[PDB]
Symmetry: D2
Subunit: 494 residues, 4 copies
């Protein structure tokens, strides 16, 4: 069942959020926010820059001070607040799913059924950890009592992309807040709206002021101020490789802040001759086409064993021809637009490189419509490893299908990339599932499925797809700072 | 390569071991120890009884006192001592493998290559844990500092069987000593010799006196004194269900000591039509016949899908006809004797019940030789679920093979037992491996193998096969006692 | 603030709860439930016996079957249900706090502010663990893939006392249900009412039928049927040592079910000369007098250093003279009645033994009122270690105060008991806090406080105060059963 | 007891170590290695540069390949090899302690009794972890089986300082090798000799070729090649802040390799009026003067409460006047030289700034001797927070002592630094110990001691003292890469 908002969406929250109050930009400047489906301005939002980030950090630092409400409150109460924020997002699900769709070009049914559900479930997951973050007592050599405190780090700068605005906000703030950090969030300039609504709910839920601060604005201004800030203890980021590089450099030059990045992928699937063929086709298809291909985990290289390759290509092409393009709010629409001009241009340029480099165009290969940044769903077969479409993240509805005959060789080809976010293995054989998944240099390997993401699992890249893990037990480690306390005693006993 | 002891085995250690010294029994009585292959007495050993156990417990209690060497020494030094004991067992490997074979009726090549290697590796594993046993710091509600100490329990009584004398000694003392407990060990009356040699090495390695005490003797005397002792904090046991019951009752009536038991099994294998047939035959065969069938994990019910059942039965029978019986010290001998008369009698009685109840005798079915407790390796096909050989632990070289056609039904049949120590699943299908292994009520489930036991894995029973786990990270929990320390403070911070 | 129920309490739930429906007893018999303050019957409740327990176990077994809703649902949804049950208990807090007070003789302000808050917070804590109960992947020797499943155990019988009916219900069902077990709960015959209300909320919250079953009734009938049941996998118990012994024996003789017990204490405090005297007096006082002394953790031996002993005794006596006895529902009443005649008789008998054995009666020492099982708050000074009041759990408002001069000696005296549930240490010295707390053989040691119990901490006894731990990360281990799955692979890699 | 090498030290290992063989530099160039006590050349060593690092990385990559000996061997055997390397270092303790002293200007008794013991114990600690590095099985939403592999990362570049050459080598390679990584180590140009000896023992112990590669050489050449290498997965570093910054930038610009740094400190002690004064004086003294002040953890700001300040200053000054300078190999010598000219110059420049800025010179304040880089042990009192000696890491025998009157204020002053490696708290009060240690932004806080470092504890900086932790359970996380494997199944059960 797919309920809808029964009156038109009214945008209310357009300001910078610091110390639980709404601020105008220091400069006074505002910037437009667009609907990618119509190319029309939805509203203007206060443009945060260095001076606004500086205010947010000061508020975040003050909220983190020893003796403050956020530091002294029970861990269990930090969890209570997170479960309350999840209840409120659940309350405003229709509103939030609609705003997400409209601002982000995101199909409404997915926004409502997947993104909103993921936000709610991830917050509830992170809430449960708050009073289960524990240190150790350690049987050190000598007459000492040694324990560790897994403290919060402090002020965490969190720079967020436009492809999953709300989900990415919750992935960042959920763990950070559960561990007792304070945060300065910079949403994507394309998609600040859902973040600012959530900030209203952070106030309503009763989080102490300055625990969450939200500074909408642009990357080289507000983002760079975060990356280079002398009093931000950690920056976490999801987005491009280029910006990731800029962030680590700025961090290195400023205060050696802790950095975790999640960057692109060129995630491969390996489909063995014994694979459930329909299952492999359907998961690989959704693996590459989900949200107009605008997923870090996009299954953008699909290697299929020769004897089933032509059948795989045939079935995949027929699957890609079934989409209905248009406004992501209209029921029955199954493909929305790309987020903006820059991404639109990149996808089309890469599609053209694929034609020019001699890949076989099975379907699509051009733009669509009189308005909106729509790209036809596009399939290429006979793709080889040195083509631009085999090497570069497209972030569009563009599927690459390749044949292999040698399993040793295709593992090498799958691993022959600076990326490593994820991969997929399709086979019925137990030994092959285990050995192949172990050999792939990828952070998540799916077996006979793809794109299965849940709050209980750590998620992150190998190699230049990033560093560190998010979510799961393991992800919570990177939002703590370990302190060893060692006390001289007269005599220790076991 | 299989080296041998180049001179005859001379038995030296025959006394009770308490406070690192050799004691005569309080009574003055001694008991015979036999070689099951010849039925000849090897030596006499001091017979421990209540009074001797009482001395051992007093020594173990004194060694556990706050301020004592064993309580105050570095955890890392407890580990150092365990690695040294492993070095010494490695030094005396030939001696120990020979003594084990001679006293226990255990094939020498297995005693040397498997049992001795298992002892050495398990001690080294347990050594590594000593200074990695850690408590927690806990973010309790209110203004308090709360930590936990995972302390040793105290004096642990450890009652050991005759089928793996040395391995079972190390499985018991390794974890207990690594966690900082002191122990009172009662070896099987049939097989005290290797334990007393190891006690000599415990002295030589430099363990503080009274940390390990070894009281050879009988079950209703020395064993019952341990189970009912008012100052033994925990009893751990491997052996019969009957004795397990006696131990828990005695424990319940005395001082509510912590009890962990490992008892029989009637461990089932399920062989699917798609299984690698030779692999399944070879592992199921070794699964049931290992050490003359005298293993808790014996694969004593083998369920095979109808379409491959007759082939499975054929191949298994030909495998069982390949043994050479005789003295377990002679190279090329592949089956030694059963441990003693009682076990011999039980096996033969159960073989006769199988014939009388209408099971199909494929091979074997009687005794062998003029001397030693030898039983022919015996295979029964067309076994049904209400036969004695399907329900009762045989502890002999007696293999039961059964057909099934419905997978739902055979899972039910495999689970239809009060036992639950282990099981095996043979299939190439990923989904079947996972779903079947999850559905089996068994402590260890092997997939496309059997009898794979290593120090890194917890091991223990579901249901009446016992309680608690041994070895692995998880096993170490049951040799600690958790103490929560909660300290009032003026103000806590995260 | 202390709100109250604005209309009279109407009792609704009086039946056996099995498969989410209300059953009459098989026999047809019912038993009375009394208010200990008035000695008047509140209502009649269906009397569960063996036949009813047998129905509950069958329902619990069916709900635990592979493929059932409770086994297949997301762990996170098990958690969701527990958070919902906590929301409902919060909704009915006034009702439940009132019923608890009326049935249990429990002061209403404590019932409302402490017990109800503890139930709610503990359920929310246990909810958070559900989808964080994890196994391991293990680098076993040889070419194998080994993982562990921390499965639920199965059907858990849970036998509950009358002193904290609601808190004890939640301590039992919260962890068990979070781990995915099904339960058969037997509330105390004195106090079934709050449990049956909670069962109504279990239905309303939407727990699958047969996941929680509640069989009110008596100990030697319904309780013994649980302890001796051939298809209950684990029994957990809080209550007397005598019954604990009966449970382990019955368990041993039947199906070797896993048993965890929490039994009495004779918990000591050690007050050093440098202690904050008022702090130590106030915590030791509340430590022994809380809930009419009817707490397992009662601080029933208080050892005070000679130089501050007379001042400690003086201040404690004046503190004990400040109570107002009467109906626990009336605002300003600070001491309610004892639960029943048996406990009343025991307390008074023990008070008389203290007078006869030459302890110094400072205040109290007799009954109070024309109705209700009230005992005057009683203080004894100059108590010595062989008096009955020094050795035996009183479970009444009876405080024992003792002098010491040697710290070595008083640690010995504090440890000289078969009990070991808890202890308290009062000092300003860092080294003394650490060394004394380490040396005490007690499951929880408080430093400069007492009776600080929270859901994040494991809680349980050393020695004859019980086995196993409840709550905290550590407590969740005892509601799982570890299964090792080891899969043969062609080649493993690190 | 302090044994000595009975014949003169002969230097043997002077070459680059790659694939367990000794290589000349590609260039052919060699560089001198000096004894800081005499300023005399000990030998010439092959100078590694980019081309040699490139060879080492290729060897390390080949050793890490799926299917290789190092990837396929049992975890327990990786541990076995580490325990063997520790046995060999123990065998060559005299040799290694002597070489360390001679090359590093390190007192021989400390080199033998502390450094060598630390190497041996840390290797044995890391050995014990190898087969206890475990992933998880995770109860993910939906019908999936999800586990994690904590794999090794891959090729780890490890850049090592000159102050603890051998200890720092073992701190780096022990965890990395235990987790299954391969390494490219660059020792300090000042101190390559002990590393090259250990490489000989790595060969002798039987580590597969290319698992450990050692490239001696200079920082901007060999070091920069490591930091900027496109096929090194992680760089770990201990040294200056400046180089740390260079490493993160180079890493950022090249392949976004994982970086962990340990950098300087300006570690403060807070001494309360109630502190054991002699204990605080002795630990603070050794805290700042250990190894000629050339420790990252140097207690280089000592804040003492006014009422005991003059007594503290008096006792500290008399302690500092007791040293005997000279050759670190001569028995009775208690202070050796600084490592080299650059460090010598910095210390003397900073001493002069302290005089010029108006700090009170109590003793020392100049160079010593005709040869060697000796600095007199120097104490400054009345130091204020804006002096260079209060702000900058000296890395010399220069002690700063300061008064405070307000505890709130001195915590602020202690935390008022971009550093944060460690701190010390001296008090008898339980509450003050806990609250102060919690409030200090430092990675290790010692209470009533200082400089207590053991293998069981994580160690690392807050703020610009670095990122990540070394040693302890927690440190092992940063030498793994987590892979989530999620497998579609037909139906999951709990
Ligand atoms: N640990 C605690 O918190 C606690 C709680 C209650 C009582 N006690 C101690 O026990 C003493 C006696 O009190 P009690 O008699 O009410 O406690 P009890 O142990 O008899 O009763 C507690 C629970 O055990 C059940 N029970 C009784 N007999 C049983 C049997 N044969 N088999 C199975 N279950 C049975 C009861 O019905 C109740 O549900 C008290 O004076 C006190 O010292 C301790
Ligand atoms: C209400 C308390 S429990 C509790 N609180 C107590 C006791 C004495 N004083 N106080 C304040 C006591 O014995 N108990 C107790 C302990 C074990 C078993 C039964 C009762 C609580 C809080 C938080 C979480 C879950 N429980
Ligand atoms: Cl486990
Ligand atoms: Cl714990």
């Amino acid at each position: 069942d797919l309920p809808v908002l029964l009156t038109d969406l009214k945008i209310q929250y357009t300001k910078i959020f610091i110390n639980n109050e709404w601020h105008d930009s220091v400069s006074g400047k505002k910037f437009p926010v667009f609907n990618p489906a119509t190319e029309e301005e939805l509203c203007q939002v206060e443009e945060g820059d260095k001076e606004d980030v500086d205010k947010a950090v000061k508020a975040a630092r003050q909220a983190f001070q020893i003796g403050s409400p956020w530091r002294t409150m029970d861990a269990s109460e930090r969890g209570r607040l997170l479960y309350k924020l999840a209840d409120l997002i659940e309350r405003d699900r229709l509103l939030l799913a609609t705003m997400e769709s409209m601002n982000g070009g995101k199909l409404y049914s997915n926004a409502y059924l997947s993104d909103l559900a993921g936000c709610i479930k991830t917050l509830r997951y992170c809430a449960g950890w708050a009073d289960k973050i524990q240190g150790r007592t350690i049987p050190i050599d000598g007459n000492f009592f040694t324990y560790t405190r897994h403290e919060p780090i402090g002020v965490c700068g969190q720079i967020i992309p436009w492809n999953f605005p709300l989900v990415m906000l919750i992935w960042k703030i959920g763990p950070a807040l559960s561990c007792g950090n304070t945060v300065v969030v910079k949403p994507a300039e394309q998609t600040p709206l859902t973040a600012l609504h959530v900030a209203s709910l952070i106030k309503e839920a009763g989080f102490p002021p300055g625990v969450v601060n939200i500074v909408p604005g642009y990357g080289p201004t507000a983002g760079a101020a975060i990356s280079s800030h002398m009093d931000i203890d950690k920056v976490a980021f999801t987005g491009s490789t280029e910006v990731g590089k800029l962030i680590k450099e700025a961090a290195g030059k400023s205060n050696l802040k802790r950095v975790t990045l999640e960057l692109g992928g060129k995630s491969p699937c390996i489909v063995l001759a014994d694979a459930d063929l329909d299952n492999a086709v359907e998961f690989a298809h959704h693996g590459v086409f989900y949200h107009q291909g605008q997923c870090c985990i996009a299954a953008s290289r699909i290697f299929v064993e020769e004897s089933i390759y032509d059948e795989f290509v045939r079935r995949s092409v027929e699957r890609a021809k079934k989409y209905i393009l248009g406004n992501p709010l209209t029921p029955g629409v199954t493909q929305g637009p790309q987020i903006d001009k820059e991404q639109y241009d990149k996808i089309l340029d890469l599609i053209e490189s694929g034609k020019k480099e001699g890949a076989k165009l099975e379907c699509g290969g051009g733009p669509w419509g009189n308005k909106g940044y729509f790209v036809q769903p596009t399939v290429f077969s006979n793709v080889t490893d040195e083509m631009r479409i085999a090497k570069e993240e497209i972030f569009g509805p563009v599927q690459q299908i390749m044949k292999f005959k040698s399993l040793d060789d295709v593992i090498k080809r799958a691993n022959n990339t600076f990326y490593g976010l994820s991969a997929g293995v399709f086979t019925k054989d137990i030994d092959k599932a285990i050995t192949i998944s172990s050999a792939l240099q990828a952070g998540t390997v799916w077996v006979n499925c793809y794109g299965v993401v849940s709050a209980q699992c750590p998620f992150g890249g190998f190699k230049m797809s990033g560093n560190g893990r998010e979510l799961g037990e393991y992800g919570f480690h990177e939002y703590t700072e370990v302190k060893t306390v060692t006390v001289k005693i007269s005599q220790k006993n076991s």
